[PDB]
């Protein structure tokens, strides 16, 4: 069989010739589908059974069917992920041979209407919300440090300025700080056809913050190509709910305040004034912990900075190195 | 005098234990336990708030940042011990 042998090793050589090739963009998976029955690849690899929202960033402009790539971990080896159209057209192929996929039943009623199943069980409609396959993210992951209360309110960011000092000490060679005065929790690029771009065009969505809140999507995303989670001051996420829907999916770090009794003297130590909002700073705080991490999967229950900063350090100590 | 005092000690200790066991059953150690962790964090986070008091973005960062370090440098902890030993001497 000259056909199989003459090409099969094509992928093996081209994923190692430019071993120093620089990665770009990113991928956020949703289905870990194996490849013993779904190989269809020149790499001869087993499959793409990685995870939902897997960690790998890819730029190799391969054919219109599959995308040979790289996985970021302790090893800097090369990987493989199917092209977005491949996962789109095959997410029904794994259910294409599902016999009664249209409407006929196998419940002893064989011959009622018969006929091939309707085309609607394909990508002819698929109109839940027209949600695409794997989503990109920056060359790094954006950062959120939720806690202890509504950011910018006395103590709130003062728990972050101290946390950003050793951070910038470990960084500054890694640092990529920015301060965003725009609401990502009120920002979603899933607009219908075209977001607002003009200024006085006299449209129904002209005097909207969407124009100046999507403008820093470019200040994030592929701008992170030099590798950097990119922290921010965003007074946007007081709960990991609105942020973790779109392609952002940020690094959510939760500084724990333990029981709702140590923050009393933490916020009342300044005496008068600080209770302008009263409840929320001690209500929005446990309104966060309320839900599970996974988003703020990072938790920071720790005393004086000396070891408290270590939790941030050890997270990014492995993370930064294992990303090349 | 010795046997009798031993009996008194035994009967009193077994009676104090047979009341601390009741107190634990009702619950009083929890108040002491959950109070010591409270001031532990109030000695904790509340020092962390003061560690950001001098992050200046009027020139105390040159010296006050070293004052904190020196106090917890195991040098200002041994110097004071030596001074206390001298005072005792």
Which among A162, A259, A265 has the least Cβ separation from residue B51? A162
From the CA of B39, how many Å to the nearest CA of chain A?
8
SS3 A315: helix
Rounded Cα distance, A73 and A127, in Å: 36
**Phi, psi torsion values for A215, nearest 5 degrees:** -65, -25
A105: which 2 tokens?
């039943």
Query: Is there a contact between A139 and A227 (Cβ–Cβ < 8 Å)?
Result: yes
Strands (E) in chain A, as ranges, are: 66-70, 78-82, 143-146, 251-254, 298-299
Encode A6-18: b = buried (16+ Cβ within 10 Å), e = exposed: eeeeebeebbeee
Residues of A within an 8 Å Cβ radius of B: 155, 158-159, 161-162, 165, 257-259, 261-263, 265-266, 269, 303-305, 308
Rounded Cα distance, A262 and B65, in Å: 26
**Phi, psi torsion values for A53, nearest 5 degrees:** 55, 60
Omega before A148 within 30 of 0, i.e. cis: yes
C-alpha closest to that of A121 among A92, A99, A91, A84: A92
A4: which 2 tokens?
């199989």
Measured between its terminal Cα atoms, the distance across chain B in Å is 43
Within 8 A of B64 by CB-CB distance, chain A residues are: none
| Number of CB atoms found within 10 A of residue A283's CB | 12
Distance of CA A97 to the CA centre of its chain: 32
Q: Is B46 on the interface with A (CB under 8 A)?
A: yes
From the CA of B77, how many Å to the nearest CA of chain A?
18
Which among A258, A263, A304 has the least Cβ separation from residue B48? A304
B34: which 2 tokens?
């959950």
State which residue of chain A sits closest to B69, comparing Cα positions. A306
Find the angle CA(A13)-CA(A17)-CA(A18) to the nearest 5 degrees.
140
Query: Is there a contact between A243 and A237 (Cβ–Cβ < 8 Å)?
Result: yes
Rounded Cα distance, A53 and A310, in Å: 26
The helix or strand, by DSSP H or E, that contains position B7, with its residue range, turns out to be: helix B3-26
From the CA of A167, how many Å to the nearest CA of chain B?
13
C-alpha closest to that of A312 among A143, A139, A173: A143
How far, in Å, are A259, A306, B50 from residue B36 at the CA level?
13, 21, 21
From the CA of A162, how many Å to the nearest CA of chain B?
5
SS3 sequence, B18-55?
HHHHHHHHHCCHHHHHHHHHHHHHHCCHHHHHHHCCCC
State which residue of chain B sits closest to A163, comparing Cα positions. B52
Q: Which distant-in-sequence residues (6+ apart) come within 8 Å of A211 by Cβ?
A: A195, A196, A197
């Amino acid at each position: 069989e000259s056909a199989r042998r003459e090409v099969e090793s094509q992928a093996q050589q081209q994923l190692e010739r430019a071993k120093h090739k620089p990665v770009a963009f990113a991928v956020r998976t949703n289905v870990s589908y194996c490849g013993v029955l779904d190989e269809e690849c020149p790499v001869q690899g087993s499959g793409v059974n990685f995870e939902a929202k897997d960690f790998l960033h890819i730029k190799e402009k391969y054919s219109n069917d599959w995308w040979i790539g790289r996985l970021v971990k302790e090893g800097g080896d090369i990987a493989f992920i199917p092209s977005p159209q491949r996962l789109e057209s095959i997410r029904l192929k794994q259910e294409q041979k599902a016999r009664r996929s249209g409407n006929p039943s196998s419940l002893s009623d064989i011959g009622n209407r018969r006929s091939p199943p309707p085309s609607l069980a394909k990508q002819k409609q698929k109109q839940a919300e027209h949600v695409p396959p794997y989503d990109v993210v920056p060359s790094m992951r954006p950062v959120v440090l939720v806690g202890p209360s509504l950011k910018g309110y006395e103590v709130t960011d003062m728990m972050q300025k101290a946390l950003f000092d050793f951070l910038k000490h470990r960084f500054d060679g890694r640092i990529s700080i920015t301060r965003v005065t725009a609401d990502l929790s009120l920002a979603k690029r899933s607009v219908l056809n075209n977001p607002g771009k003009r200024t006085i065009i006299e449209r129904s969505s002209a005097r909207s913050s969407i124009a100046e809140v999507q403008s820093e999507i470019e200040r994030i995303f592929e701008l992170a190509k030099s590798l950097q989670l990119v922290v921010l001051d965003a007074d946007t996420i007081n709960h990991p709910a609105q942020l973790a829907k779109t392609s952002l999916a940020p690094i959510i770090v939760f500084v724990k305040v333990s029981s709702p009794k140590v923050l009393q003297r933490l916020i009342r130590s300044r005496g008068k004034s600080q209770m302008k909002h009263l409840t929320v700073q001690m209500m929005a705080y446990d309104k966060l912990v309320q839900c599970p991490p996974e988003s703020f999967d990072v938790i920071l229950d720790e005393n004086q900075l000396e070891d408290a900063c270590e939790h941030l350090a050890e997270y990014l100590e492995v993370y930064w190195r294992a990303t090349h | 005098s010795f046997f009798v005092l031993n009996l008194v000690l035994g009967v009193l200790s077994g009676e104090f234990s047979k009341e601390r066991e009741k107190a634990k059953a009702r619950g009083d150690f929890q108040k002491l336990r959950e109070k010591q962790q409270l001031e532990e964090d109030l000695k904790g986070y509340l020092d962390w708030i003061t560690q950001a008091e001098d992050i200046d973005p009027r020139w105390n960062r040159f010296c006050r940042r070293k004052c904190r370090a020196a106090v917890k440098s195991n040098v200002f902890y041994w110097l004071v011990i030596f001074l206390v030993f001298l005072n005792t001497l």
